[PDB]
């Protein structure tokens with residue numbers, strides 16, 4: 448068990464390609480990975496589809512059955528749907544229940560691989576839908592696969608660390624485990640008035656027995672690789688020493704990358720890659736997930752690069768993908784150049800945030 452598990456099948460990718468907000472992204476991601484032949488260095492595992500019972504380990508039957516109902520024909524005019532979070536952000540597209548069950552099952556399959564000791568790293572680039580609530584779709588997320596995966600991992604591993612490097616706050620995962628000390632959630636994210644989903648200030652630390660077992664790092668526009676890694680490393684260092692996790696779930700949404708229409712952070716995959724490396728050197732069972740990422744070519748660039756990092760491989764700069772070659776224009780290279788725009792993060796504020804978190808984590812004692 449030294450070779451990473453790569454969750455993939457043509458049917459799975461085809462289903463993931465059907466998501467309204469990210470059409471064909473799953474195909475572009477796999478295609479680039481395939482073109483670099485990285486899948487040949489991984490153990491390819493076909494994802495099982497999640498059963499109703501498996502999904503009900505987190506979601507309520509009422510939500511699941513409603514989702515299943517409107518999905519059968521794609522009824523986007525059902526009275527109850529709005530209260531279930533279906534609407535503009537999360538349309539009731541036809542087959543959405545099967546799509547959600549596939550993504551959920553994929554993450555669960557990855558978790559099962561980790562449990563069975565088939566690998567130390569399992570990857571589901573089409574997972575990471577961190578906004579989904581117990582009975583509410585949210586932020587393009589219909590099912591919280593990350594939560595399902597964490598719950599599966601808990602069958603074998605005592606403490607789970609969830610690290611969320613998406614541009615957005617991993618609120619759905621944080622909320623799901625807000626009450627417990629057995630799962631710690633760490634989220635680095637943009638935090639600004641009005642910016643979705645609005646939660647996750649540094650003062651948000653969890654509830655009850657879960658107090659101080661939620662960690663949030665509010666960040667402003669324009670952050671680049673060096674500063675981001677400095678922040679991420681300091682937080683993760685403190686978290687690791689205090690929490691001593693037995694397994695890790697890592698969400699690597701590429702909407703932080705320069706050129707993403709979200710136009711907030713100014714990162715390159717190299718910076719995120721450094722964070723990933725730091726986590727990998729803990730040598731723990733690690734479940735790798737995707738997430739946001741709306742510059743499709745750049746998202747493919749990012750996750751392909753990260754797959755290379757996981758494999759310890761250095762990748763050729765020239766894009767080898769023929770099928771989607773034109774999408775990588777005009778320069779057709781793997782590297783991504785940061786935009787020209789200011790880092791809005793004041794060093795004093797960042798330091799305040801870091802100090803606050805360090806104070807919070809002192810309460811965390813295993």
Ligand SMILES: CN(C)c1ccc(C(=O)NCCCCCCC(=O)NO)cc1
Pocket residue numbers: 536578586587613614615643700702738739740
């Ligand atoms: C240009 N256009 C049609 C839109 C632009 C922005 C949104 C939006 O922010 N919606 C709120 C939901 C955002 C979910 C973000 C998901 C994510 O990346 N999570 O990590 C909607 C439409």
Ligand SMILES: [K+]
Pocket residue numbers: 611612613614615616617634635636
């Ligand atoms: K995040």
Ligand SMILES: [K+]
Pocket residue numbers: 624625626627628629630631632653657660661
């Ligand atoms: K927690």
Ligand SMILES: [Zn+2]
Pocket residue numbers: 613614615700702738739740
């Ligand atoms: Zn996001």
